[PDB]
Structures are given as C-alpha cells and as structure tokens.
Amino acid sequence: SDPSSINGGIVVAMTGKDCVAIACDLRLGSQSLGVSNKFEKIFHYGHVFLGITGLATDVTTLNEMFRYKTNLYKLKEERAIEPETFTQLVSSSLYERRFGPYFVGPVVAGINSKSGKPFIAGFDLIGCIDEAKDFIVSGTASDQLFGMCESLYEPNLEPEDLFETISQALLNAADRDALSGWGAVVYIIKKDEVVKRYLKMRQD
Amino acid sequence: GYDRHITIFSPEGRLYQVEYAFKATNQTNINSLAVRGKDCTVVISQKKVPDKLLDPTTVSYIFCISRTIGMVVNGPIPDARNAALRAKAEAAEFRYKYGYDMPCDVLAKRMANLSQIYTQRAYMRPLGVILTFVSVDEELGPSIYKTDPAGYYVGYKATATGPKQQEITTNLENHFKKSKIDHINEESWEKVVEFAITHMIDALGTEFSKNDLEVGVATKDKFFTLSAENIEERLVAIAEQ
Amino acid sequence: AXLX
Amino acid sequence: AXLX
Amino acid sequence: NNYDGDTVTFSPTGRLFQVEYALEAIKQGSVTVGLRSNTHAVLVALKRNADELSSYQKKIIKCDEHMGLSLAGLAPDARVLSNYLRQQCNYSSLVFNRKLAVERAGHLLCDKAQKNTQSYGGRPYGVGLLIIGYDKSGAHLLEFQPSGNVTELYGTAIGARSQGAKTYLERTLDTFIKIDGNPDELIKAGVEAISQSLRDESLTVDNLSIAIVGKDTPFTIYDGEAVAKYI
Amino acid sequence: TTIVGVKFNNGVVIAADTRSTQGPIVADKNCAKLHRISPKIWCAGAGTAADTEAVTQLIGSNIELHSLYTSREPRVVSALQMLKQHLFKYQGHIGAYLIVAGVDPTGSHLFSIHAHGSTDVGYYLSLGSGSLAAMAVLESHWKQDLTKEEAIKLASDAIQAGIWNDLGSGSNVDVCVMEIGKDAEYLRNYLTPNVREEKQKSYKFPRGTTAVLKESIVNICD
Amino acid sequence: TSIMAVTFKDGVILGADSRTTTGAYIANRVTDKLTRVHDKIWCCRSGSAADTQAIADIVQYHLELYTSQYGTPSTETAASVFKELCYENKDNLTAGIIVAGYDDKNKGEVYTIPLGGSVHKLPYAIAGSGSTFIYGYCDKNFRENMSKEETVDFIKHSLSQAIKWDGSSGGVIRMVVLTAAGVERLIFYPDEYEQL
Amino acid sequence: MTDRYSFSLTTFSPSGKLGQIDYALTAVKQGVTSLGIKATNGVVIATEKKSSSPLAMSETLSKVSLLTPDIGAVYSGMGPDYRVLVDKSRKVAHTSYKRIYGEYPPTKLLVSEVAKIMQEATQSGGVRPFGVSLLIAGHDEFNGFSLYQVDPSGSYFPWKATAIGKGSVAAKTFLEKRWNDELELEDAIHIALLTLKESVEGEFNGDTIELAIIGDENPDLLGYTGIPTDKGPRFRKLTSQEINDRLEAL
Amino acid sequence: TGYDLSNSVFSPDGRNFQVEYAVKAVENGTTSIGIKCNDGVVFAVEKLITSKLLVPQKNVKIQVVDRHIGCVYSGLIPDGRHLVNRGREEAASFKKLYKTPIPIPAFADRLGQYVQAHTLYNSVRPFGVSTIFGGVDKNGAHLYMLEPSGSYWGYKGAATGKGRQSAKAELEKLVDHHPEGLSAREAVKQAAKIIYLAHEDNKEKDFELEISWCSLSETNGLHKFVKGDLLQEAIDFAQKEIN
Amino acid sequence: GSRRYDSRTTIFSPEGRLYQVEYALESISHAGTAIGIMASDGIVLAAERKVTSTLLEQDTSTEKLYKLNDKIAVAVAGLTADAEILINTARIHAQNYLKTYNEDIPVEILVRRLSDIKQGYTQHGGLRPFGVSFIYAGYDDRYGYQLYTSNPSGNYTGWKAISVGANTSAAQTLLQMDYKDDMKVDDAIELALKTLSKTTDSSALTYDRLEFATIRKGANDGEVYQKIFKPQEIKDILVKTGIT
Amino acid sequence: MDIILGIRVQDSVILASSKAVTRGISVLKDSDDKTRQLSPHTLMSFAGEAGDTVQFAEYIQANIQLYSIREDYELSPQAVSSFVRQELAKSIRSRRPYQVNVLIGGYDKKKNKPELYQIDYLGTKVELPYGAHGYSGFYTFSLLDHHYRPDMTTEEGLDLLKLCVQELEKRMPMDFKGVIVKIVDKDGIRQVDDF
Ligand SMILES: [Cl-]
Ligand SMILES: [Mg+2]
Ligand SMILES: [Mg+2]
Ligand SMILES: [Mg+2]
C-alpha cells in the first residue's frame, strides 16, 4: 500500500576525476517474495544515463517514455541530448503529472560532450531537481546509501578507484535492506568509453 | 470577384473589405484631433446634432475607457460603441490579472490585434472605425495611440482624423516645425485645449459655438470630458486673444 | 517529496 | 492558513 | 429572385422571400375555419384525401383539455409546433398548477417561428394554425402564420379559397359572436362559413372535421358518423 | 526552510538557507531557494520544493512574455497577482510559500504569498519552518532607514538564527540584493559557516577489493 | 479578527485591528483589513485572508467595469456583488464581510454579510471573532447621528475592548473615514488605546 | 452566429497554383525592403522605417523584434500580420520549448514553429495566409550563427545573405558581389548599410533605418549578476546614434 | 457588385446594404412614437384594423421590460418581440447582479450592442424593426430610438414607420412651442393627436389607438397602459383636432 | 450564409475524379525530381533542388530528404511546409509503435498510416489536400529493403525504382532501361545520378543542386545505417561517376 | 481463479492453470480453462477479479487477432507482451482498473526460442525461466530454484510441473481441482489431456 516500496530496489550515482559512476541492484519483488533477479534499473539515451527506483511498472513506463522523447529530440535537433537538458526534460515530465504522479526516484548521470564536465542529478516523484557535486541516492535503502556515501566518498577519484567506492556504498547499503539486492550493476562512464560491471553479492 | 466580399487577398495582394471599412470611417463627417501638453493630452472632435428632436447630451463620440484612458472614435456609432465596450472590458481585465492600470499603448496594441484578426478570419467583418486613445501614462507621459481597420497602430506627437484630416495634419506639422518640440509647451490643460481649438479653427476655416465641439482631457490619474460650459469658458478666452 |  |  | 436563397437574406424592398414561399404552402392547403362566441370556440376543417382509396388527412390536433388547433399547409410542421404547445401547456400545469393562457400560447409560437426566420441553415415553418381554447378570460381564437405573426380574432379562416368564409364571417359577426350557451348553433355557423369556400365539392361524412372547447366542454374532436348531425 | 526579506533605503534584499529535507534526512545540503522571476524581481520559496520551483518558473515565463508584449520592465505587483491567483485556484494543494521582492519603474517592493493565496506587505518578513527564529531576530534589530549593508547583515543574521536553531534549516546563506537603478546582485553562498571538518581517515579501497562476475563495453555510439 | 463599520452625521467610518494568525502565531501584526473596492465604497474583511482578498479583488474588478459603463455604483450595488460571490460559493468560502460606503444622496451606509452570504443593512455592524465580546458594549453606547469625533471614540473604545479580550485581535487600530470631504485614514497605536 | 467557415479558403487551381499564397507573396513584393547578412561572428538584419505621417513617432513602431535573447526577426509585407506572428512566436518559444527543456530553442526549431503556424493559415478553415515574409537571425550553442527566411506558404530556407520585398532582386545581386565566408561582423553591418541605400528614397539616417545584430553576449544588458553561466543576450538593436556613426565612414 | 446579398459585407462606399434593406421593412410598418415629458415618457402606436374580426383592445403591441421600461416598434413584429425578450433577459441579469433596476441608458446600450451584433456576420440577418423605448430611473426620464444598424440616441420625441415624417413634423412643433417642458397628461393627448395625424399616410384601413406611459408622479415611475376614461379622453382631444 | 464561398474540396467530377487531388498532382509535377532505387544490399535516395541561388546556405539545408526514424527516410516532391506537417506526424507515429511494441515500426505500417491521413483530406472535412508526394526508403526484418510512394490521393505502391515530381515520364523510362534485379548499391548510386543528369531542366548537374542519401547494411554486421550526404561528399560522388 | 504457473524449457513454454471456479462456499465449476490463445504461437493464462479476467483476456485476444489479419503476420511474443503490459499500465490509473494478472507463453519463430512473460495487474513485466501468480509462487519458486535446469526437455518440464502441483495439493488451503496444462512450441499450442 506504499507504492514506492512494493517492488524494492536502489540506485546510486557519483562523480570522479573526469568520470561518473551510476549503479543499481537487480531485485524485483512483490513485498516479501523475490520474483526476478535480472531487473535492471539503469537505462541510457545516447550518452546520458538514467536510473529509476520505485514502482516497477512506472520505472518501465518512464524508460519507454524518455526513449520516445529523446528519439524525437534527436530527429529534430540533429544531436544527442545532453545531461543538463535531459535533467530538465525529466523534471517537466514528472511535474506534468503533479496530482497523479509516477511513484519513482530517478537519477541522471553522464558527461556533457561539449564541456567535458561530469554531471549527476536526482529527482523526487514530482520532478524536483537535486543537483550535486558528489553523489545522489535513491530507493528503499536510501538512508543506508546516504550513510555509506557520506563517509566513503572523497572528491576526484580515478575511474578504477571510483568503481570500488560506489560498489562498496551500494553493496553494504543493500545488505541492510530486505527489499534491495539480489545482484548489482555498476556503470563507469568516461568521456567516450563506458564499462559495465556486474558485482558478486549475497543472494538473500 | 468574391475576393471583394470577404477578407481574402485579391490578385494584387489587397484586402478590399479592409479598404472599404476605412471608407465607412468618414460616414459621420466629423473631424477629431489630439495634442499633448506637458502634463496632459487633449482630444477634441466636432459635435454635429442635425435633428432638433435629439437629446444633444446623448450624442457623443468620446468614451471614458478607464479612470486614465479616454478614446475618441471616427466612424458609425454602433461600431464605435462595440469597440468601446470591448476596450472597457479589456482594460478592467488587465487591471485584475496584472495588478496595475492598463497603459494606453498596450490597450491600443490589444485592440489593434483584435482588428487584425477580423482582417484574417473570414466570419468576422472589420469595424468601420478609427480609435484614438489618450492618457497621461505613468511611465511614458502624455500619450496618443491610434488604431484603424487594418490592425495598424502607432504613437503620435499629435494627430487628426476624419474627412478634412489632411488640412489639420499639415497645420499641426507646420506648428511643430516652428516650435521645434514634441508638444504644446503649456502649463495648464485649459490653454492646451485652447491651442487645440484654435488650430482646428484655422485648419478648417470655421468658427465654433459651445455646442459644436466635444473635448476630452487626460491628466495624471484621471481622464474627463468637458461640459458645454467649460468649453464656452474656453471659447471666450480665445476670443479675448 | 522534499521540503524546504 | 492565515485567518483574520 | 437573387434574394430568395435562404431566410437570412432581405430583398432590396425589405422582404423575406423564403418566409413568403412558406406562406404559399398554406395557400395550397385545404380550407379550415375558426370562430367563437363568449362561451365556446369552434374549429371546422375540410379534410383532403389522396384518392378514393385513401384516408382523409387529419387537420385538428388536441393540445390540452382546454386548447387545440387546426392546420393548413405542411402537416409535419404542425406536428412539431402542436407538440411544442403540448409541452408548454404541460409545463404550466406541472410547475405552476396553471392552465396556459391562450394568449401566451400565441406569444410562444410566434417566438418559436421567428428564430427560424433569422438564422442560416434553418427554414421557416410551412404551416398556418388556428388555435382555439377556453381559459381564465373566456373563449379565444388565434391565427398563426409562420412569419411568426399571431393574431386574436372573433373568427377567421385559412387555406385555399378561405376568402369566401372570411367574408361570410365578416358579415355574420354580430350574429355568431352572441351564440352563447348553444354548442350546436355555433358549430352550424362554422359549417356554413366553410361552405362559402367549397367548389365542385360538398361536405361528406368522412370529409368534415369539427372541434369545440368552452365553459364546460373539454376540447374534443368530431369525425365520421359523429359529424353526420351537421351535413 | 528559513527565508527572509528586508527593505532598505534604495531597494530590498532577500535571503535563504540552503537545506532540503526528506523527513529527518538531509536530501540536499546546498540547494538554491532564491529564484529569478525576472532580472530585477527575485523570489524565495519554502514548502514543497518542486511546487516552489515550478510555480516560480511558470510565472517567470508569463512575466517575460508580458514584458515583451507591453514593451515595459515587469512590476513586482504583476508577479504577485499572477502567483496569488494561481495558488488560490489550487486551493492550497500547490504548497508554495514565497517571499517576492524586486525593483521596477514604480519603486522597490516586498511581499509574501501563502499557498492558499493570501498576500502580505511589509518592511521585513520571514517564512518557513525557521520563520520564528528569524522573526525573533528581525523584531529585535530592524529599524526604519536601514542602509544596504545594514539590511544585508540583518537578513543573513535572521537566516543564521534559522540555521542554528531550526532543524528544518542548515548549511549556507544565499542573498540577493535588488537596489533601485542598479542590477540585482545574486550572492550565492554569501556565507558558508558549516564547512565539513577534515575526515579522520581515507576510505579509498585497495583495487580488486570488490568481487566482479562479468565485464563488458557498453555501446553509447551509433 | 475584530472589525466594525458605523454610520454617523456626515457619513460612515470603518475600523479594524491589524492581526493575522496562523494558529496562535501572529503571522502579521500590521495587516490592513480595511480594503477599497471603489473611491468611497470600502469593506472590512474577516475570516480567511485568502478568501477575502480573492473576493475583494473580484468585486473591485466588477465595480471598475460597472463604473466604465454606467457611472458610480451605489453602496447597495457593491454589497450585492459581494453577496452574489459569498452566497453562490458558500461551501468553499470562509468570509465575513462588512461593506460601507458614502453616496451624496444616501449619506453613509453599512451592509454586513455573514458566513452564509445573507445581506443585512444596519446603522452599524460589528464582526470577527473579537466582536462577540463587545455586543453588550456597542448596543449600550451606539446612537444615531453621532459626530465624527464621537464616532472615532466609539470605534476606538469598542475595538480596544475586543482586542483586550480576544487573543485573535491586536496590533494597531485602523480606521477609514468616508464623507463628502473625501477619504481619511486613521491609525491608533497600543500605548494610546490600551489604557482607555 | 459563430464561425461557420470550416472549409479551406486556399485551394488548388487547375494549373496547380495555390492562389492565396501567390497573392500573399505579391503583398510581400509591395512591402518595404528588408535584408539580413551572416558574418563569421554575427548576423545583421536591417530595414527602412518608412513613416506614415511625420507626426507619427516611429520609434514606437518596431519592425525588428527580439524573439528570444539570441533570436531576432524582421519582415516585409503587412505590418499587423507580422505583429501577431511575433506575439505567437515569442509564446511558442516558451510553451513548446523553454517550459519543457529549461533553455531557449535553437534558431532552426523556433523558425520551424513559426513556419508551422504560417502553414496552418494556408489549409485551416476560414482563414487567409499571412501576408508577410520573415527573416530570422539567431544563435545557439550547437549551430552557431544562422539566418532564415520564412514565406507565406510556411516554407523556410537558410541563407548566407538575402533580401525581401520591394527592391529585393537588385539587393540580392548587390549582396552576391560583396559576400564572402570571411566577413567579420562590422563588415556585414557596413555592407547592409550600403545595400539598403539603393532602395531608400528619402532621408537615410539612424532615425529612418532600423537595424539589429545577433553577435557577442552582452552582460551589461542582462539586468543582474551572480550566475556566471548566464552571460546575456546576443541580440542587440543598434541605436539611432550607432547607425549615424557608421554612416560618416560609409 | 453582388455586395448586397450577404449581411456584414462592406460595399465600396462603406455601406452594409442588408441593414439598409431592413430599414425598408421598418419604413413599411405602422407608425409608432414616443414623447419625453417633464417627469416621464409616453408611447403610442397605430394598430391597423385589417378586419372587423380582430378583437378590439386584444392585440397589444406595446411591451414592458422589467417594471419601469416601455418598448414600441415598427416593422417586423416578431423581430421586435425577439428584441424585447433579449431586453428582458438583459434587465433581469442586471437587477440580479447589481440589485437596482437597470438604468435606461444602460438598457439602451444592451439592445444597441445586441442589434449591432447582428450586423457582424453573414449567418444572421439584421433586425427588421426600429424601436422606441424608455422610462424613468434615478436620473429622470429617458426616451430612445434604435435602428437596425444598432444606432440609437436620446430623443425629445421620436417617430418611426410609414407616418414617420408627418409625426416628426408634429413633434418638432411641440418641442418649439413648449420649451420649459410638457406635462405627462399633456403628452398623452398630444400622442393621440399625432398618431391620428400620421394615420393620414395609411388611410385605407382605419385603426385602433394604443398608448402607454411612465411618469414619476402619474404612475410612480412604473410603466402602465392608458385605458378607460383617460384613453377615451385623449381620443376625443385628437378627434377635435383633425376637424 | 458562408456556403457561398465554399470550393467543395472533397467532391467527384462527373468522370469520378477528385478535382483537388488531380490539381495537387499537377502542382507536384513542377517540383524538383526525386528518385528512389532499391538494390539487394541497400537503397538510394537522390533529389534535385528547386533552382538554387549562389547565396543559399547549402550545407545547413534540407528541402528534399528527411529522416523518419533510424531505419526509414523519405524524399519529398511538392510543398515543403505541407510535407513537414506530415513528417512530424510520421515521426510521432513511429515512436508510438516503438513505445507500444518495443519493436521498430515495419515500413509498410508507417506508410499506410500516412497515406490514410492523406485519404481523409479527400473524403471529409472540406479542407484542401496536402500538395506532397513521398518516396519512402527503409529497412525492416520482415521484407528487408523497401521503396514506396504516396501521393495526395493517399494511394501508395511499392517499387524497385521510382521517381516523383518533374519529368517522371522520362526518368521512369530511363530507370526501366538500365535497372536490373541483382544490382549493388554503388551501381544504383550511379543510375540515380545519371538519370537526374539526363532529365534535369538545368544546364548541368552540380553538387550544390542535390540532396543524396543511402540506406545500407554497410555498418557492421546485420544492422543498418542511414547516410545523408554532405555537400563535399556529393561533389566527390559526382566526380567518381564522371558527371563533372 | 487462483493458480497459474509457467515454465520455459529448452524448446517450449508450459502453462499450468487451476480448473476450479469458486464463489462463496460453493465450487461452481471444476473444468475451467483459464487461458486464451492470442495467436498460433502465443498463449495467455490469467487470474484475478471475477469477470475482469475473461473480459481482459478476450479483449487482448481480439486486438492481437485483428493485428494478425491486418498485416498477415504473427506478432512476436516480446511484442505481444509489451502491448499487454501497456494496456495494464494504462488501466491501473483508470476510474476502474482491470484486476488481472497474466502469464504469456510463446514460441518466437524468428529466434526459435520459447519465451515466458509474467505481468501483474499494475503492468509490471518480467521475462522468466519459470513464473507464477498469487500464493502459488510461495511454494513453487523455491522448488523450481532447486529442481529446474535451463536445457530440460518438454518431458522433463512436465515432470517438474507434477512436482509443483503435488506440493500445492499438499500445502495449499484450497481445493483448486487440478490443472489444465498446455504446451507452446515451434508447432503451435496443444493441451495435455491426462494430468
Ligand atoms: Cl489580509
Ligand atoms: Mg538485502
Ligand atoms: Mg473577415
Ligand atoms: Mg489581543
């Protein structure tokens, strides 16, 4: 009866030296029952990455929606949408459903391909933008993620260091939440290569 | 030639209905004129009561649109009153929506846009009127803005309208040529009214009694029209001159 | 939803 | 809400 | 001529030709007569048939217990207008517990017809009506034309050759106006009036139609053997 | 939140703290609660974060269009009227609590707007969970005829009361100064009295610490 | 709130306290509850601040439009426009409004519009939470055709008492004087009215 | 009452011309000359302020309009039609772009929207086409400087330089001689001022010429400071005085 | 040409020929008048007796609006009824919102704007009536005449229909011979005379006279019909004068 | 009323033709020629610009060739403004299909809906038809490479090679002559340019009066790439086949 | 309604669905087929609110059959599943949402792979080796976590299913009156008649 914690799951994002990382768990459940171990919560539209936590049906719907909107954007503008811009489009789209919202906690990460700047942001279900230098967190284990990140994080990490840090924040937060976990994926994003790593984690 | 009955283009790229609407502008055979003082804006127009049976007080082509805006019409009265009622509604709405009094020039633009629509959308005819708006704007000072059936509008130093308009226009241009300024360099609106009546007399080559004219004055924070008596007082002072 |  |  | 394309167009002499052509279908209509005393009001109508195998088109329609009418012209248009009248009489009862004044019935029909003479796409009604009734101020006869003009009369007639009856009634006025408390005498006068408009035909038993309303008679309609009494 | 507005001699100044909360949790340590409606009309907003941003942009957009249409610089009372009538229509459900201030051809102005749509005029105002801490300071130190520098101090002092004494407020002070005849100056992080101390230890991990199952290169290209 | 309007020899006076509340917190101690809907037609507002402002703005707008088309509206007409709003939206409104104006024909007039949107024309009217405490006083001390100074005193003394007992009233006492001579704003501070 | 004109007023003739579009272009032909030139670091758009009476104050009538802080427009044809198009163009930049993406539309896309509006006046029921051609000069981060012409049909094209209205044929020829891909903005202003003298009869000064640029960001025109990523409008109207300064070195 | 086949089209002189044709329908109708007086207004009209069969007194043509306004018209009768129906709605809604009964100038513009509206589109036809109307409000008496174009003004006296010229001349005399004002009961008699005089121009059929009035003193500012001894008395005063 | 001024855009002639469709087609016949040719390993779109001025910005320009999605493009002959209205509709329709089925829209399905829109303007609503004919070039995994055309009637048909706009009679004859089924893309590129070269109303075909696109499997393995040629790329392909 | 399962093996998808229909304290029917064929290689089982289930299933079936006729082509299981999900995702915010859960089992002939989709009434879609709706999953998921192998034959699949039905008949509170089993593979859809 609280739509934001029927299915469970989490997303975290971090900035480093000329890179960003964004990670999620793989659980999809119906309350106590784990149902799927392969439910990824991160999507990309060109070089802009979007993670979505919350009600899975809305997660799926919103991915389908932003694919649609960015495809048309590309056709009309003749370029890939940038993270600063995509962030604004996410905000508009959620607030448009102000009094009947999507029960989601989206997170945007990527590198602006003109300015080279790393960029992350997070949103509430009705579109409020939270831009941050350091990290954004989302999902049923968000308290834990806030704790892990605020203590583990330091500015200007190299991509392979940032990888360890974001992975340890995710894993240890997931393990203190009954509704998150069951696998995990980490995206390391540099100006033009993106590595995707699946983490080994406890399956309970 | 059905391009002559509705507002679509003719082969030479013209709108006959708009052009004919301009011709209805003079149907009444009145001339109006407006000038700016330092502190005020004056608009005068001829008042012709043919029939002896008319109540002369109900015969007017000057309208108080808002506390601060007055408007004189050249054209038939039904179209004139239609335009005034709309202007009154638009000026009241603007005040309510935005929390300050509608400026003369913005009202002029708005009424011009409304007219433009009648030149483009077929089911509406243009109004056979030219609207001269006057005020002492709180930002821009004394103001005169004028609208026609084409949807054209612009601000004036001074202006005139009607069948014998060109006489009055050149009369005024000749004054400003000489005076070298934008307006009537006069303290009191009483004397600016006097100037206005005086130069209308020269340009038209006719004399006026108190019941031949109709005068509206705009000062900071009110627009008002004069009685027969305030005009008589004004005609008297021009004579002792 | 975040408050201020 | 503000009352009077 | 160039000005008869629709009702929304005036001619250069200020006429409305579609309204005038509507008036014309009334003229082709079978004759009908109205007349009244102070105690009753009577309608007589000549019914027309298609051929000898056909029925004789009804021309009289009951509107309420105290009101009803006769038609000349387009019959479906009488059905529309009589149905409107039924509703208006009805509304007056349910809401105010008040029998609708025949005069108001008049004004209501005029205003209904008029709308169809000022707007594009509609068309004027193509029927004339004679309305009789008995109300709080006595017996009444009205004449309705689809120009929207309604008129209160002691007597009248409409349709083809109605001018015969309308003349007869004009001389007879001082007599029939004072046939009080005698239903059958008022009807006789009505039947005679209509006879001034016959040509090559006379009133048969399935040809004549009469209606009466008044002080203590609900509006009722007589056809067939019930009219033999009067031939 | 804590937010304030204080009139001075030639204008008006507004200020806000920079904390965002999700229940007891600090969602954002440095968000901007000062919004530009037009170049010389600024807004501080408390309440539902998305609502104050959205309502502020919408009216900012319409004010721009209006300014273009009228060939005039926008007035504060227009922002005021548009905001209040919008909020009233929504019967309180749009949770925006705003201090609106600016300079325009008419002078300098200071207003507040509550979410049900009532407006207030004053020389000093405060709104938000920190509004009582701030108002205690304002009622203590405000005077008629403040200079610009006195007004700035007074405002940020009022925000500081909120930061220290209200759990709904923290981190930094943002200010905006709108003086007659001059450009608005927006002073983002005017005060930063809550700098995190140096951590005791670095938690950077030995590389290889995290167990990986699979890698793969992601295709971002065409 | 505490509000009232009183007719006298030369016209009418409106008075009000300056307190707005948000529970027991005073959100505004210098509120102006006396509001102009036309040059010489004003109202006193009580109830919801948002409702009463929204209403007064609409009424001001109607009367501005009335003025443009038909000249100066009567006080009765202004009260009718308030009523129409309050009555037709009675489910969604918390507005207790007193309307007061000056004609040259009609002199001073007061119409009070309580919660349900009924209208009542009276010599004087009191309203707002603080009014309960001064029914006794006001009924005992009001007379018709008082002078300006007597009427200022009556209002000052009455609202003084309402403010004293009602926690939802306070600050300054504002008044608005409405005569043939124009429009006059008065203000009286606590140190004066408190110790009356 | 109401609009019973729900059918098109522009239809194909048997030769395949759309009469009303052709006639609208004819109205544009009659119109006063306007032009635009694209430099390497700017665009200039210019036209003659041909006054109706000398009692008129023609600064109150702006023929060159700001659409966004980086986009400007000018026209030839019917003034009132242009006025309402600017109103509609300004608004659609917000409703269908800025309110969605939090930034102003790029030139081609705003142009695209104006074109859509003009196309609809060519096919919708009960209306005539717009009697104007626009030139829209603009800048955006990923396309740089650009210049577009929009016609009554709704068609638009990108130009290095062009002219429209009365003396357009002559002026287009003049511009082919002078235009190269190395023009610095000051050179384009100069060429625009020369090209415009050919087609102006009467007085030729900074009170009868309206002229605007899309060039460098103008922080001094922003109205506020403290957001270092907001740098100011690239659109600037040249003053009466600025024009006269460039006419003495003509 | 063809400019005259479609309402709301300007001809090249600047005219709306369909309105002008509506005026012909007005000129074709029976005569009606109004006389403004000291503290009120009087309305009169000629009713042509088409036949013996018309019930006398019982086809009333003057119409009341609200409680204080009288309307009379010449031309297409149903068009006039339609106009008065709208007038009644306009007065009802004014009184509803503003409490006071509608002032006469205010009422005049309501009809004016509505009539003028029917000259803006080709999908409606102009009104085939000229209407004389007026009454008493807080500012005194007002008389008005309104034409198919929407044009209206205030009048000392006014006439329309077939006898409009005859009647106009007659009115002009009264205005000159009574410059300090005409009393309500004087005006009632004069009105009877003038309708009898203007019946000259319509004289195949004889007619029935109908009068009404509002006077601050004689009817308390309410619109009433003139009947019985007062009507007969004003008929007699008219009869005197045509002999 | 307003019936007086109604052209009745959606009626039949006594011969049972649709006047406005016929007249729209007549309009299209003066438009820059566009050609589509389908190979076994790709598709070519080539089109001639309506006669240039030297001052036209030719590289940041598009008048003839539009991208519908990643697998489908169109070539336009007729009113550009009319065509954009339809192009955005088609682009949106593609995205609705993708959103609904998580599969790219089959080419015919897209073509059918656009043609169905056109058909409507000829049967109801009293509006003028769209003065546009399209050549659709696209790929899908049911039919592979496909060419279609639609015209103002909303009729559509599929082709191995086709032209629209001006001089389609001459162009169709020439394509019929030299087209053969086993053809590669690079042969079809040549055929397209040679055909325009001979049918052009201009003196000689230059880079600056053309638009050009291919749709090949010529990316990497079992997937498809749209290439809209830059001016310099056309100038080269014009040399490479010896037309300049 | 109540029990619906699905297992995907090497070369097919098997759907098992309970036969009972119960209202109040009466089992009204013991031979109910809780399934609709959407296309020749796609099958959908359903469970949920009375009335809603069949109305929804038949409505999807009507839409898919229309598409088939229109394009003379069979939509892939992935495509059908996405269509179904969207319908449910719209529904969840309607005035009265469809309270229906489904399993979609199909053989994709382009890929030559069997596919099983589990979709709940909110429009939550997941592709799975094995699936269940309602309380059934609480016994079968763990059992299948143990006994299931990716490369099983259709016969191995049916034995695995016998295990699931046995467990459910041992531990479930209700008598669901057995299951109807159906196999979807390269040759279409068939029903096992003795289970
Ligand atoms: Cl308040
Ligand atoms: Mg866990
Ligand atoms: Mg028109
Ligand atoms: Mg107190």
Side-chain angles (χ1 to χ4, degrees), chain A residues 10-30:
Chain A
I10 42 163
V11 160
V12 58
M14 285 181 194
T15 61
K17 188 171 213 56
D18 306 306
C19 61
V20 285
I22 192 184
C24 73
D25 71 320
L26 301 185
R27 190 174 178 271
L28 183 141
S30 179

Side-chain angles (χ1 to χ4, degrees), chain E residues 1-20 114 117-118, chain I residues 3-7 16-26 28 75-76 79 118-119 122 124-129 148-149, chain J residues 4:
Chain E
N1 142 78
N2 255 130
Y3 303 91
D4 64 339
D6 41 69
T7 345
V8 91
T9 314
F10 272 121
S11 80
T13 60
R15 310 166 71 182
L16 300 166
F17 281 107
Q18 279 293 304
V19 171
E20 275 174 44
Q114 188 282 154
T117 78
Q118 198 166 190
Chain I
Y3 292 102
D4 72 320
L5 304 160
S6 191
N7 189 16
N16 182 6
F17 271 77
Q18 278 286 145
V19 167
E20 273 170 45
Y21 299 175
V23 169
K24 303 298 211 165
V26 180
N28 194 256
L76 299 190
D79 280 24
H118 289 74
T119 80
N122 66 201
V124 294
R125 139 172 99 63
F127 280 102
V129 288
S149 65
Chain J
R4 212 178 310 284

Side-chain angles (χ1 to χ4, degrees), chain H residues 57-248:
Chain H
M57 321 185 291
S58 49
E59 344 76 63
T60 67
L61 205 201
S62 190
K63 285 180 78 173
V64 174
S65 312
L66 190 161
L67 299 197
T68 79
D70 297 338
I71 299 161
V74 78
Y75 81 99
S76 294
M78 313 171 55
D81 282 21
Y82 166 80
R83 198 175 59 248
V84 321
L85 274 175
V86 169
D87 289 342
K88 289 173 199 290
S89 290
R90 277 155 182 184
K91 187 163 177 208
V92 75
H94 284 65
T95 61
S96 83
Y97 206 90
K98 198 192 188 217
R99 289 174 193 178
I100 286 160
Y101 301 110
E103 55 202 64
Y104 290 105
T107 310
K108 66 187 157 179
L109 280 197
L110 179 50
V111 159
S112 180
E113 296 292 350
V114 193
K116 186 190 206 269
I117 286 159
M118 286 164 76
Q119 192 283 333
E120 276 149 12
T122 259
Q123 184 169 30
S124 303
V127 300
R128 74 175 163 75
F130 285 96
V132 293
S133 285
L134 311 168
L135 304 172
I136 289 155
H139 178 269
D140 58 84
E141 216 211 323
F142 294 77
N143 294 281
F145 292 98
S146 62
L147 171 68
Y148 288 86
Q149 169 184 332
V150 195
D151 284 349
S153 73
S155 301
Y156 56 104
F157 343 85
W159 288 98
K160 287 149 163 149
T162 191
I164 44 164
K166 228 170 164 62
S168 62
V169 198
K172 291 227 283 310
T173 302
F174 195 115
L175 295 165
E176 273 160 78
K177 294 213 163 168
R178 304 305 212 93
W179 194 90
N180 58 81
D181 60 12
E182 260 161 306
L183 291 163
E184 197 274 307
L185 175 66
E186 269 302 341
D187 303 323
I189 298 171
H190 174 73
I191 295 174
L193 280 171
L194 280 165
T195 316
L196 210 57
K197 194 184 310 174
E198 310 304 62
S199 54
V200 176
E201 202 98 47
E203 301 290 63
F204 192 74
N205 54 56
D207 296 302
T208 59
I209 298 317
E210 213 172 312
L211 192 154
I213 61 167
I214 312 305
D216 278 349
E217 286 153 328
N218 297 262
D220 61 305
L221 277 181
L222 192 35
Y224 66 87
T225 55
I227 301 182
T229 41
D230 282 5
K231 244 146 305 152
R234 287 171 180 278
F235 172 102
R236 193 162 75 80
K237 221 146 191 277
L238 308 206
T239 56
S240 192
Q241 184 58 59
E242 264 145 28
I243 292 154
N244 284 334
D245 293 327
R246 280 171 191 71
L247 289 175
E248 284 141 29

Side-chain angles (χ1 to χ4, degrees), chain G residues 50-110:
Chain G
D51 291 358
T52 54
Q53 284 181 23
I55 288 155
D57 288 359
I58 286 166
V59 172
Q60 186 168 28
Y61 156 76
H62 270 259
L63 297 188
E64 185 159 293
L65 194 46
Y66 187 98
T67 301
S68 282
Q69 303 175 62
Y70 329 113
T72 302
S74 66
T75 312
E76 181 171 29
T77 289
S80 188
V81 178
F82 273 105
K83 175 218 75 199
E84 206 78 347
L85 292 167
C86 294
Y87 180 71
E88 293 300 333
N89 300 291
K90 56 162 67 169
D91 298 344
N92 316 299
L93 289 179
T94 310
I97 300 184
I98 303 168
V99 184
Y102 181 80
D103 284 281
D104 222 285
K105 181 183 231 139
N106 294 288
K107 310 290 147 194
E109 276 182 351
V110 172

